[PDB]
Amino acid sequence: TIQPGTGYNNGYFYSYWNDGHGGVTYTNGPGGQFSVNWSNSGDFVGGKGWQPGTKNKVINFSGSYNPNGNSYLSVYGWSRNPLIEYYIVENFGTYNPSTGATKLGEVTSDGSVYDIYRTQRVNQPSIIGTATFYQYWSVRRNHRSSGSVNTANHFNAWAQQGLTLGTMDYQIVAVQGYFSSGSASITVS
Numbered sequence: 001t002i003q004p005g006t007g008y009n010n011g012y013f014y015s016y017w018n019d020g021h022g023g024v025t026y027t028n029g030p031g032g033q034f035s036v037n038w039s040n041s042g043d044f045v046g047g048k049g050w051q052p053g054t055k056n057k058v059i060n061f062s063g064s065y066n067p068n069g070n071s072y073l074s075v076y077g078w079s080r081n082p083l084i085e086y087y088i089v090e091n092f093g094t095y096n097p098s099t100g101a102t103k104l105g106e107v108t109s110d111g112s113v114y115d116i117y118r119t120q121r122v123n124q125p126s127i128i129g130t131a132t133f134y135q136y137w138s139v140r141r142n143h144r145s146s147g148s149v150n151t152a153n154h155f156n157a158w159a160q161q162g163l164t165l166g167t168m169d170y171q172i173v174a175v176q177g178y179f180s181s182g183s184a185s186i187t188v189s
């Protein structure tokens with residue numbers, strides 16, 4: 001397993017962040033593979049990808065994802081100027097992260113319709129420190145743990161709806177969890 005932090009592993013950028021609560025282990029495997037095992041964890045986010053990401057990347061992911069409680073499997077990343085945290089959610093556990101969020105449209109991509117939403121984080125942690133910033137979401141209706149994500153279809157739909165992205169920071173396939181349990185093994189390319 002590895003310490004929380006960022007870096008490169010077998011050619012892929014990785015980010016593993018947690019709240020220090022314990023109960024979660026993250027491991028970097030060969031190529032674009034990573035595994036997450038958690039049991040009564042706290043808040044955490046980890047996965048592999050790129051730094052920086054691009055606005056036209058076709059991301060391939062494959063493996064298993066078995067959450068028991070609150071967790072998401074997503075293409076996840078950020079932009080700067082404006083600061084935006086974004087998600088293309090392929091699967092989740094007990095909580096749909098768009099619950100209560102205002103719907104801003106639909107986009108069809110890679111075999112499913114996705115619902116689009118915008119939320120706001122107020123004085124929360126970010127890649128640039130504590131801040132208030134928006135979050136963009138595409139939530140897949142047809143849940144899966146393998147597939148291909150044509151990021152451009154999402155970024156373009158978001159733009160069309162008034163959700164613009166700044167300069168890309170990291171872009172990864174991530175397993176996020178919030179006080180839950182589970183296991184996942186994902187390969188990115």
Ligand SMILES: O[C@@H]1[C@@H](O)[C@H](O[C@@H]2CO[C@@H](O[C@@H]3CO[C@@H](O)[C@H](O)[C@H]3O)[C@H](O)[C@H]2O)OC[C@H]1O
Nearest residue numbers: 015017043044045085121124125126127128129
């Ligand atoms: O040391 C700093 C890092 O901690 C920082 O990392 C990012 C912090 O925000 C993370 O995003 C939130 C983590 O908490 C969850 O509950 C929220 O849902 C996520 O929005 C992000 O994943 C980290 O990369 O980056 C800057 C460093 O200086």
